[PDB]
Design a protein around this ligand. Sequence first.
Ligand SMILES: *NCCOP(=O)(O)OC[C@H]1O[C@H](O[C@@H]2[C@@H](OC[C@H]3O[C@H](O[C@H]4[C@H](O)[C@@H](N)[C@@H](O[C@@H]5[C@@H](O)[C@H](O)[C@@H](O)[C@@H](O)[C@H]5OP(=O)(O)OC[C@@H](COCCCCCCCCCCCCCCCCCC)OC(=O)CCC/C=C\C/C=C\C/C=C\C/C=C\CCCCC)O[C@@H]4CO)[C@@H](OP(=O)(O)OCCN)[C@@H](O)[C@@H]3O)O[C@H](CO)[C@@H](O)[C@@H]2O)[C@@H](O[C@H]2O[C@H](CO)[C@@H](O)[C@H](O)[C@@H]2O)[C@@H](O)[C@@H]1O
Ligand code: CLR
Ligand code: CLR
Ligand code: PLM
Lengths: 4, 961
Amino acid sequence: GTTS
Amino acid sequence: PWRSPWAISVFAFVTSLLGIGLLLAVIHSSVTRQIDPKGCRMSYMRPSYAKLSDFDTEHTRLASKYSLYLYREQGIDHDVKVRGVPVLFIPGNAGSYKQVRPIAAEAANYFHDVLQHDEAALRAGVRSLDFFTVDFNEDITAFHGQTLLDQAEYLNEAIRYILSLYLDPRVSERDPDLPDPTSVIVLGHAMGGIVARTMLIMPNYQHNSINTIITMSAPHARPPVSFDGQIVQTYKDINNYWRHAYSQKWANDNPLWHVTLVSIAGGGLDTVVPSDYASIESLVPDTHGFTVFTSTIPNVWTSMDHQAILWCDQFRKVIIRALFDIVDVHRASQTKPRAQRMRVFKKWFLSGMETVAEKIAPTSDPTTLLIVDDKSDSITAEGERLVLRELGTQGSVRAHLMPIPPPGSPELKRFTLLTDTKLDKPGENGKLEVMFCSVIPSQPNPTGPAIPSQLDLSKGNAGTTRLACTNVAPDVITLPASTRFARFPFSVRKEAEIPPFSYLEYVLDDISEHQFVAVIEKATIPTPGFVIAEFSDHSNSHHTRHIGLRNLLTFGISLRLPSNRPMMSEVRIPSVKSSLLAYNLRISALECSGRKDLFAPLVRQYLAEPYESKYFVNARQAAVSLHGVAPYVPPPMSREPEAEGLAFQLWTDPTCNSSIQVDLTVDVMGSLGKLYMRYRTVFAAFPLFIVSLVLRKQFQVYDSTGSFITFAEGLDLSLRQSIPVMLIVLAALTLSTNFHQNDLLIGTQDPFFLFLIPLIGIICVGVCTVVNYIALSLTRLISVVISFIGFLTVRFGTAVLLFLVSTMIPYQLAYLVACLVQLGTLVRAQRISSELRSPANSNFHNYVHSIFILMLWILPINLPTLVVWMHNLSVHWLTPFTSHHNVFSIMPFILLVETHTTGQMIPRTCCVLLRHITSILLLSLALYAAVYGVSYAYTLHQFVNLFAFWLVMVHSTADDW
Ligand SMILES: *NCCOP(=O)(O)OC[C@H]1O[C@H](O[C@@H]2[C@@H](OC[C@H]3O[C@H](O[C@H]4[C@H](O)[C@@H](N)[C@@H](O[C@@H]5[C@@H](O)[C@H](O)[C@@H](O)[C@@H](O)[C@H]5OP(=O)(O)OC[C@@H](COCCCCCCCCCCCCCCCCCC)OC(=O)CCC/C=C\C/C=C\C/C=C\C/C=C\CCCCC)O[C@@H]4CO)[C@@H](OP(=O)(O)OCCN)[C@@H](O)[C@@H]3O)O[C@H](CO)[C@@H](O)[C@@H]2O)[C@@H](O[C@H]2O[C@H](CO)[C@@H](O)[C@H](O)[C@@H]2O)[C@@H](O)[C@@H]1O
Ligand SMILES: CC(C)CCC[C@@H](C)[C@H]1CC[C@H]2[C@@H]3CC=C4C[C@@H](O)CC[C@]4(C)[C@H]3CC[C@]12C
Ligand SMILES: CC(C)CCC[C@@H](C)[C@H]1CC[C@H]2[C@@H]3CC=C4C[C@@H](O)CC[C@]4(C)[C@H]3CC[C@]12C
Ligand SMILES: CCCCCCCCCCCCCCCC(=O)O
């Protein structure tokens, strides 16, 4: 995934 | 004669135009002038949260409203088990529990990548950090004090649950020989830092359960707004608790003896919480905590938002490294002792050039013995700078030994070394190693076995002088890389980051026991790198400019540092202390003749009062904004005269043989825009100073002539005599061991800042005029809607309110409803006055309008409590209300609004005594709003309630009710  | 409510005097219009103009100039120049560079690199992660749903209403009543989560980073944390040190993150006013993503992910990754393989660090007691985060439903703590207390109580119970987790084999996997955890590390953001401090004074606090508090952008010194009395009282409680506890002489009597509090402030880019309020200098002694700005944190060197302080990449790396250097799972409190924690926090958060900085190498154990020939080719003459323009010219390991001058001379001397090359740690091979060498006597005098001591022999002959040498890597000061291709101390792109400079600064007395400073050039092939080392005299390097603030603001200050100046120069202006004044710094071009300079000039703009240093790489033109003596914060503690005011530390290449010019002038518009953070809260109370003086003039003329003039006409009459006189009284009031000296009026008793009283007065005059016109427009607009409904019809065709407040309605909802009913009465009065245009109908309209303006200027204070109550209803939380306080806080307004709906005009006013009571009450309200309005804005509702009660008494029995 990965978010900020 | 009938004078329109819309008409305004030229005098009152011009003054209101200047007030609105000065408001726009302050607001505009606070978002465009003296703005710090933004240098936060975005952080990305894979978030996951495990709700600890077994922490329920059996443990605390608030668990039906609040929730606790364990952060799990996907790909690193594969199960919901605790395996390390518990850390608790507390979000701020309307913050999210999900704001723990960046700091918790960095901790999860760093232990995975580095520490879990480091067997020595694991042997020393380092484990994972378990990040627990708390869901407060985005509750507004800054505006409600019972919310703050509820959060603190919930989190004390949550800490008990968290520490119970480490007792359960089904939830905890730890080494069996480890002690049980008895403490949690608390990281708080904004009002979370206050919840963290509030937690230690609550009755359900478990002793020794918190020893480490780190807060990011938390207003420790002062409440952000004072709209709630419980917030103000809780701030008094916690601030008094810290001050009283740390004022104890015997540590056993000090409840906060083992507690360290570190306050990190975003700086000038933080527009939610003023960075002035983050100062804990009046709360925590330097042995137990400090306030640091993100602009002085090494490898961060940037200012931050309120929200960016959590997700900044550079900052999260630093905070995680600091947190990993304090944990110790061999101790039941999962941290190192208090002094060791303070030393680590100073290493990771501070520049290293502070007075509280500790020097390790001068008095530590030697780590190498250097054998060097007796020919003394390495040993240079005293008083010569060592300049290495390239590393590895000769092709062999070299030693440059610089003899330390004898301490016989009285004047203070320093050794300074600057290099762009990384300095080798002990027992490591690199390009460069710097070390303090002491002569080993040729006589076989017994000493330590020197088993850790490695040996470097560069003699290659029969001379073979022996030196015991200590590596200085422990005390290296990291400086931002100042090259010609650099503009900021940071880099938002990781690829473009320049490896920082290395700096050593020592007082001669610290290292006098040694005999040499050895710069070991280990490079063989020519590689880029420079080294400058020298001893300098305090007279040659440090300059102080004793120039008054008046002359500095008039002319500015200009210096000419000579060509024969050291690498590092300091310029101190002791008269630059205010946080309200901003400057412009200019550094002249370095006309390096022939050769290029080894590095570009570096300027460190720093204050000792909080730890705020700002770096300007390749400095030519710098905006100087400092967080010094702020208005409403507790007074600064005592300091030596050598640490007062603002200082600039300058690094230039000393081999250029060119003088440098430093200019410092005042930035008038930047200084003007500095006022927004400091005085924004003045505008919930101080416009009531103008309104009360206008209502005083309206009632004076009415009681004397029987014509109740319009608000604009009352303002015109007040600006001529009444308002100017009472601003002079406020100025005279300001001129006439206490930590609350700075809570009243303009926050400062300094005479220089007396112009702030006229400034605030004129801006408040403009704001009151604008709000008057807004209310007139709203009345006319509702009247137009009513007339339009009437035409559409024509062409196409009590005493119960007391019961409501006592049961469930907070008096703020009743106050809003009273304001709406007053607006309805105002619309009715305006319509009647337009239809009939009687002098009696103009009086009632003007009177109702002025009372509406008075009611409307209190609504800002009451509105925050409505949003809290509506939110709690949404969450299904019910808060009981004390009927005695609700009824007495709203009944005078209810009775006044009812009397106005009956259409009764205030009776005109032993009779002169009743005439003077209205004047005295309104004068006292004006003065009270001006003086106690910033710090005690919650009392204005009660005082205006008292005024509404008197007007109900004049209405009743001073006439036929
Ligand atoms: N990766 C890692 C991470 O990342 P992220 O996260 O993604 O990040 C990044 C990003 O960012 C951004 O964005 C962001 C994001 O977000 C997300 C998030 O979300 C959430 O969280 C959130 C929360 O929730 C919220 N709430 C917030 O919070 C906060 C907290 O935190 C804190 O703590 C506290 O403190 C606070 O701050 C809070 O907030 P609040 O509370 O809410 O708010 C506050 C403020 C604002 O408010 C407003 C106010 C109101 C209004 C009113 C006013 C008044 C008015 C006036 C008057 C008028 C009247 C008229 C009259 C007439 C009558 C007659 C009749 O506050 C403030 O600000 C204050 C100030 C202002 C105010 C006031 C003033 C006034 C006045 C004054 C006057 C005058 C005076 C003057 C002068 C005088 C003097 C002179 C003479 C002498 O926030 C947070 C965030 O963080 C969560 O999530 P959830 O939960 O799931 O969800 C929920 C939602 N809600 C978390 O988790 C997350 O994370 O995103 C978004 C989108 O969506 C956005 O939006 C945000 O922002 C961006 O970027 C950025 O970043 C940073 C930020 O963050 C920065 O730094 C940078 O730079 C950039 O920009 C993006 O792009 C990114 O990506
Ligand atoms: C700086 C402050 C004054 C901002 C408010 C400006 C606006 C709302 C004010 C300033 C001067 C005002 C005008 C002054 C005089 C009159 C004459 C009157 O018979 C009708 C309204 C009218 C035409 C006013 C309308 C509103 C007005 C234009
Ligand atoms: C006569 C005029 C000035 C009255 C209008 C002022 C009202 C609408 C304003 C003034 C200050 C405002 C508050 C300032 C900031 C916050 C924090 C936020 O998290 C919730 C809303 C809340 C609590 C605002 C509610 C509305 C508020 C009370
Ligand atoms: C006309 C009325 C204007 C009054 C000005 C009020 C300014 C409000 C300031 C907001 C306080 C900070 C909000 C929460 C911040 C925190 O979490 O600490």
